[PDB]
Design an enzyme around this catalytic site. Structure first.
Site, PDB file in Angstrom:
ATOM      1  N   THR A  19       0.410  -1.701  -0.074  1.00  0.00           N
ATOM      2  CA  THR A  19       0.117   0.383  -0.055  1.00  0.00           C
ATOM      3  C   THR A  19       1.022   1.603  -0.178  1.00  0.00           C
ATOM      4  OG1 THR A  19      -1.773  -1.125   1.004  1.00  0.00           O
ATOM      5  CG2 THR A  19      -1.970   1.403   1.306  1.00  0.00           C
TER       6      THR A  19
ATOM      7  N   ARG B  47       7.154   4.565   1.667  1.00  0.00           N
ATOM      8  CA  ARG B  47       8.014   5.762   2.659  1.00  0.00           C
ATOM      9  C   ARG B  47       9.498   5.225   2.942  1.00  0.00           C
ATOM     10  NH1 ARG B  47       4.759   2.021   5.788  1.00  0.00           N
ATOM     11  NH2 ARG B  47       2.066   3.378   7.037  1.00  0.00           N
TER      12      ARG B  47
ATOM     13  N   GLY C 195       8.522  -8.674  -2.911  1.00  0.00           N
ATOM     14  CA  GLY C 195       9.046  -9.163  -3.666  1.00  0.00           C
ATOM     15  C   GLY C 195      10.424 -10.421  -3.518  1.00  0.00           C
TER      16      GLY C 195
ATOM     17  N   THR D 286       4.856 -10.650  -6.448  1.00  0.00           N
ATOM     18  CA  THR D 286       3.481 -11.082  -7.083  1.00  0.00           C
ATOM     19  C   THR D 286       2.419  -9.080  -7.276  1.00  0.00           C
ATOM     20  OG1 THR D 286       2.672 -10.091  -5.022  1.00  0.00           O
ATOM     21  CG2 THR D 286       3.561 -12.789  -4.923  1.00  0.00           C
TER      22      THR D 286
ATOM     23  N   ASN E 282      13.758  -8.024   0.562  1.00  0.00           N
ATOM     24  CA  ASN E 282      12.686  -8.370   1.042  1.00  0.00           C
ATOM     25  C   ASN E 282      12.256  -8.151   2.354  1.00  0.00           C
ATOM     26  OD1 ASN E 282      10.500 -10.545   2.411  1.00  0.00           O
ATOM     27  ND2 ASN E 282      10.008  -9.806   0.297  1.00  0.00           N
ATOM     28  N   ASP E 283      10.971  -7.517   2.413  1.00  0.00           N
ATOM     29  CA  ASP E 283      10.544  -6.700   3.386  1.00  0.00           C
ATOM     30  C   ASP E 283      10.332  -7.404   4.904  1.00  0.00           C
ATOM     31  OD1 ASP E 283       8.437  -7.981   2.154  1.00  0.00           O
ATOM     32  OD2 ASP E 283       7.425  -6.015   3.105  1.00  0.00           O
TER      33      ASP E 283
ATOM     34  N   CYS F 267      -5.142 -16.311  -2.819  1.00  0.00           N
ATOM     35  CA  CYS F 267      -4.299 -15.197  -3.035  1.00  0.00           C
ATOM     36  C   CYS F 267      -4.110 -14.845  -3.953  1.00  0.00           C
ATOM     37  CB  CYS F 267      -3.009 -16.034  -2.561  1.00  0.00           C
ATOM     38  SG  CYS F 267      -1.772 -14.986  -0.966  1.00  0.00           S
TER      39      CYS F 267
ATOM     40  N   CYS G  53      -1.108 -13.490  -4.830  1.00  0.00           N
ATOM     41  CA  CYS G  53      -0.055 -14.840  -5.157  1.00  0.00           C
ATOM     42  C   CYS G  53      -0.121 -15.854  -6.436  1.00  0.00           C
ATOM     43  CB  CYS G  53       0.721 -15.571  -4.681  1.00  0.00           C
ATOM     44  SG  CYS G  53       0.314 -16.915  -4.258  1.00  0.00           S
TER      45      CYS G  53
ATOM     46  N   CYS H 101      -3.285 -20.152   0.471  1.00  0.00           N
ATOM     47  CA  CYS H 101      -2.622 -19.538   1.411  1.00  0.00           C
ATOM     48  C   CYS H 101      -2.433 -18.503   2.724  1.00  0.00           C
ATOM     49  CB  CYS H 101      -1.503 -18.317   0.587  1.00  0.00           C
ATOM     50  SG  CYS H 101      -0.707 -18.797  -0.827  1.00  0.00           S
TER      51      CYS H 101
HETATM   52  N1  LIG Z   1      -4.452   2.023  11.357  1.00  0.00           N
HETATM   53  C1  LIG Z   1      -3.365   1.538  10.542  1.00  0.00           C
HETATM   54  N2  LIG Z   1      -2.472   1.016  10.841  1.00  0.00           N
HETATM   55  C2  LIG Z   1      -1.190   0.040   9.827  1.00  0.00           C
HETATM   56  N3  LIG Z   1      -2.075  -0.508   8.970  1.00  0.00           N
HETATM   57  C3  LIG Z   1      -3.058  -0.851   8.505  1.00  0.00           C
HETATM   58  C4  LIG Z   1      -4.592  -0.200   9.230  1.00  0.00           C
HETATM   59  N4  LIG Z   1      -5.450  -0.018   8.742  1.00  0.00           N
HETATM   60  C5  LIG Z   1      -5.096  -0.895   8.134  1.00  0.00           C
HETATM   61  N5  LIG Z   1      -4.180  -1.683   7.641  1.00  0.00           N
HETATM   62  C6  LIG Z   1      -3.481  -2.508   7.104  1.00  0.00           C
HETATM   63  O1  LIG Z   1      -2.134  -3.121   6.425  1.00  0.00           O
HETATM   64  C7  LIG Z   1      -1.762  -1.834   5.459  1.00  0.00           C
HETATM   65  C8  LIG Z   1      -1.385  -1.000   5.861  1.00  0.00           C
HETATM   66  O2  LIG Z   1       0.404  -0.654   6.617  1.00  0.00           O
HETATM   67  P1  LIG Z   1       1.543  -0.502   5.877  1.00  0.00           P
HETATM   68  O3  LIG Z   1       2.731  -1.750   7.308  1.00  0.00           O
HETATM   69  O4  LIG Z   1       1.532   0.626   5.586  1.00  0.00           O
HETATM   70  O5  LIG Z   1       1.783  -2.080   5.158  1.00  0.00           O
HETATM   71  P2  LIG Z   1       2.363  -2.182   3.564  1.00  0.00           P
HETATM   72  O6  LIG Z   1       3.198  -3.128   4.081  1.00  0.00           O
HETATM   73  O7  LIG Z   1       1.369  -3.065   2.745  1.00  0.00           O
HETATM   74  O8  LIG Z   1       2.294  -1.016   3.035  1.00  0.00           O
HETATM   75  C9  LIG Z   1      -3.445  -1.265   4.869  1.00  0.00           C
HETATM   76  O9  LIG Z   1      -2.929  -2.207   3.180  1.00  0.00           O
HETATM   77  C10 LIG Z   1      -4.067  -2.064   5.718  1.00  0.00           C
HETATM   78  O10 LIG Z   1      -4.466  -3.074   5.021  1.00  0.00           O
HETATM   79  C1  LIG Z   2       5.312  -7.657  -4.302  1.00  0.00           C
HETATM   80  C2  LIG Z   2       5.348  -9.202  -3.042  1.00  0.00           C
HETATM   81  O1  LIG Z   2       6.073  -9.960  -4.244  1.00  0.00           O
HETATM   82  N1  LIG Z   2       4.488  -9.565  -1.614  1.00  0.00           N
HETATM   83  C3  LIG Z   2       4.988 -10.755  -1.249  1.00  0.00           C
HETATM   84  C4  LIG Z   2       6.278 -10.920  -0.546  1.00  0.00           C
HETATM   85  O2  LIG Z   2       7.303 -10.949  -1.146  1.00  0.00           O
HETATM   86  C5  LIG Z   2       5.863  -9.667   0.752  1.00  0.00           C
HETATM   87  O3  LIG Z   2       6.854  -9.932   1.576  1.00  0.00           O
HETATM   88  C6  LIG Z   2       4.779  -9.882   1.330  1.00  0.00           C
HETATM   89  C7  LIG Z   2       3.956  -8.386   2.287  1.00  0.00           C
HETATM   90  O4  LIG Z   2       4.007  -7.142   2.177  1.00  0.00           O
HETATM   91  P1  LIG Z   2       3.020  -6.228   3.091  1.00  0.00           P
HETATM   92  O5  LIG Z   2       1.827  -6.600   3.775  1.00  0.00           O
HETATM   93  O6  LIG Z   2       2.539  -5.137   2.480  1.00  0.00           O
HETATM   94  O7  LIG Z   2       3.884  -5.728   3.571  1.00  0.00           O
HETATM   95  O8  LIG Z   2       4.037  -9.680   0.519  1.00  0.00           O
HETATM   96  C8  LIG Z   2       3.947 -10.677  -1.023  1.00  0.00           C
HETATM   97  O9  LIG Z   2       3.554 -12.237  -0.377  1.00  0.00           O
HETATM   98 CA   LIG Z   3      10.215 -13.261   3.340  1.00  0.00          CA
HETATM   99 MG   LIG Z   4       5.452  -1.688   5.252  1.00  0.00          MG
HETATM  100 ZN   LIG Z   5      -0.175 -16.925  -2.224  1.00  0.00          ZN
END
Ligand SMILES: Nc1ncnc2c1ncn2[C@@H]1O[C@H](COP(=O)(O)OP(=O)(O)O)[C@@H](O)[C@H]1O
Ligand SMILES: CC(=O)N[C@H]1[C@@H](O)[C@H](O)[C@@H](COP(=O)(O)O)O[C@@H]1O
Ligand SMILES: [Ca+2]
Ligand SMILES: [Mg+2]
Ligand SMILES: [Zn+2]
Ligand SMILES: Nc1ncnc2c1ncn2[C@@H]1O[C@H](COP(=O)(O)OP(=O)(O)O)[C@@H](O)[C@H]1O
Ligand SMILES: CC(=O)N[C@H]1[C@@H](O)[C@H](O)[C@@H](COP(=O)(O)O)O[C@@H]1O
Ligand SMILES: [Ca+2]
Ligand SMILES: [Ca+2]
Ligand SMILES: [Ca+2]
Ligand SMILES: [Mg+2]
Ligand SMILES: [Zn+2]
Lengths: 308, 308
Positions: free
Chosen positions: B13, B16, B72, B85, B112-113, B175, B177, B182
């Site tokens: 989403t 940062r 990724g 994905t 990877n994150d 999913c 993916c 999953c």
């Molecule tokens: N108040 C909140 N704080 C953090 N994450 C939230 C909140 N409400 C919903 N979320 C979920 O977590 C995601 C945002 O957290 P973040 O770690 O920024 O996600 P990402 O790693 O996917 O960018 C949103 O896609 C949402 O599904």
């Molecule tokens: C782009 C992609 O292939 N993403 C996959 C993982 O590699 C990643 O670690 C995870 C968390 O991502 P988040 O929830 O957005 O932090 O999402 C997916 O499973």
């Molecule tokens: Ca991983």
């Molecule tokens: Mg994040």
């Molecule tokens: Zn999956």
């Protein structure tokens, strides 16, 4: 004359003891049912070891130690079986090293049977020279062993690589471990043995060209066009395959070795499930059937051969 | 003055960028939506990095390098995103090191994150000093990171620890993916966001004391007595918990750290599922919620802080 190990393998059905050469030739193998109680099990292990040791002298093999493969969680450093599922009853907090070493006057190694299978594949099989690979061994239950950086992963409490208890259903069939949905509860010999009896109960197993029902009767009936046994084997193989996907997405080994008598029957479905469901980046994984006749037993021997 | 890293985190989403001190204090954080196309993404990464670098000087922080956390599969040695994905579209075979290092004149790390989350927990969190632990990070998707012998497991093709794609159903929900079943497809923010919309479609979400529907509306409705949202969160948490059982039976870590905003909501069910279904020998596992505010971002910084 010939440098050898004594190897013991205790599974969910059979207790085997073998004289194995340096080179991984099984010189002689003794087979009994694994007894159901501790007293009979430990006595039979000892009786079969003493006899194998006496025959080794007549065969001109010099025994260097005893390696033991067993189901259950094992502390190898202390030679202690810590905890077993009911596949081997009365097999908790058992010191195997002391009684075997006192009786035979040999050094004793002990590990889980799936971890032994891995050691066999690393020394004598298709894991040789590889930094990371995983093996899944189908017998009565399903065992696992994981090699990472060339060495076994045992885990922080000796429970790494209990891969038969990978869970691939929120519900699914009961496992002997006490859970449900484990790949063992779908795909092991005893799970297929159960499904074969189920079919045969409804007189729905035997088909044209057939006559202790078990796994191989189910496989033999599916080859011969039985639609419900094919389905059962498809569900079974899919479950195993999903267990394999979890391993790929966890450890990402370069090779997965399937062994045990069901391996050949499952391989093609496991590769289909990987292709259909695993991430692209694990699609280059090699999945093979083991070329070894008895990985667990050979692995038990390899502890002796490598570490004595 | 203050030794610092530039850290970037690209999720499903948000994008940062932060200035992070030696000590793991976030000095300043910039937040934008992660763009949907490659051209806009790479330009915004660069624009936000240049701006953060200019502010770091005004804040008297000395930037030592840039660490990048991304969804990724990632080749960290080459600083290349290999495959993603669809949570991050147009994010395949992308060299991130070259453009960032040419523009900023700094060394660049990439991982990877979920692997970054692990690095954060090892340096600043409850993984400090531990030989083996696993982290699962719930955000948009579910990430994972695995520490074994004090170091990350990356896997033979950089796909280790893709723990959101542990599969715990033979069927189950689709999913992103491309698979189904999953744990990510049950329990991630986007999976709960979907279920919340489903309920709310049938006008079946909002209850007495409530008013962009999402995960927290589902959790808030369950706390306030909505029976169908409780059920949805139970299924979700059970799935996550079974994912955790697979990890325990695979790697047997001494600690599992859950992070991300859903962590607190899932922890008690995950511990119940372990208690009810995992082998006795993994029952001593510690399962905690992370004490860090942003593991991914802190982990990206830790690559710089530790390796520069
Ligand atoms: N108040 C909140 N704080 C953090 N994450 C939230 C909140 N409400 C919903 N979320 C979920 O977590 C995601 C945002 O957290 P973040 O770690 O920024 O996600 P990402 O790693 O996917 O960018 C949103 O896609 C949402 O599904
Ligand atoms: C782009 C992609 O292939 N993403 C996959 C993982 O590699 C990643 O670690 C995870 C968390 O991502 P988040 O929830 O957005 O932090 O999402 C997916 O499973
Ligand atoms: Ca991983
Ligand atoms: Mg994040
Ligand atoms: Zn999956
Ligand atoms: N012809 C066969 N050869 C080997 N195993 C078989 C055969 N037929 C069935 N099996 C299954 O495998 C088990 C025997 O293989 P083995 O490796 O000796 O098992 P264990 O390790 O459980 O003792 C049996 O419990 C059975 O379910
Ligand atoms: C006694 C016990 O706890 N057994 C479990 C594993 O530790 C063992 O590796 C596996 C294979 O056993 P086999 O099929 O009989 O070879 O069985 C069970 O899952
Ligand atoms: Ca019993
Ligand atoms: Ca094992
Ligand atoms: Ca899309
Ligand atoms: Mg056996
Ligand atoms: Zn089980």
């Amino acid at each position: 004359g010939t440098l050898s190990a004594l190897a013991v393998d205790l599974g969910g059905t059979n207790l085997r003891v073998a004289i194995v050469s340096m080179k991984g030739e099984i010189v002689k193998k003794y087979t009994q049912f694994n007894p159901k109680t501790y007293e009979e099990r430990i006595n039979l292990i000892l009786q079969m070891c003493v006899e194998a040791a006496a025959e080794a002298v007549k065969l001109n093999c010099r025994i260097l130690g005893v390696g033991i493969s067993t189901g259950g969680r094992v502390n190898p450093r202390e030679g202690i079986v810590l905890h077993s599922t009911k596949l081997i009853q009365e097999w908790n907090s058992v010191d195997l090293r002391t009684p075997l070493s006192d009786t035979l006057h040999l050094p004793v190694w002990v590990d889980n049977d799936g971890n032994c299978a891995a050691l066999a594949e690393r020394k004598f099989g298709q894991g040789k020279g590889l930094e990371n690979f995983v093996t899944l061994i189908t017998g009565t239950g399903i065992g696992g062993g994981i090699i990472h950086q060339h060495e076994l992963i045992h885990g922080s409490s000796f429970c790494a690589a209990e891969l038969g208890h990978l869970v691939v259903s929120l519900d699914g069939p009961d496992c002997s471990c006490g859970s449900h949905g484990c790949i063992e509860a779908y795909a092991s010999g005893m799970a297929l043995q159960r499904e074969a009896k189920k079919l045969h109960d409804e007189d729905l197993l035997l088909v044209e060209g057939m006559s202790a029902v078990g796994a191989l009767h189910l496989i033999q009936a599916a080859k011969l066009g039985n639609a419900k046994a094919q389905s059962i084997l498809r569900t079974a193989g899919t479950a195993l395959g999903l267990g394999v996907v979890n391993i790929l997405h966890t450890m990402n080994p370069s090779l997965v070795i399937l062994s045990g008598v069901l391996a050949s029957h499952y391989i093609h479905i496991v590769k289909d499930v990987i292709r259909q469901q695993a991430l692209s980046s694990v699609q280059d994984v090699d999945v093979v059937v083991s070329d070894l006749v008895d990985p667990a037993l050979l692995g038990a021997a390899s502890m002796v051969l490598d570490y004595t």
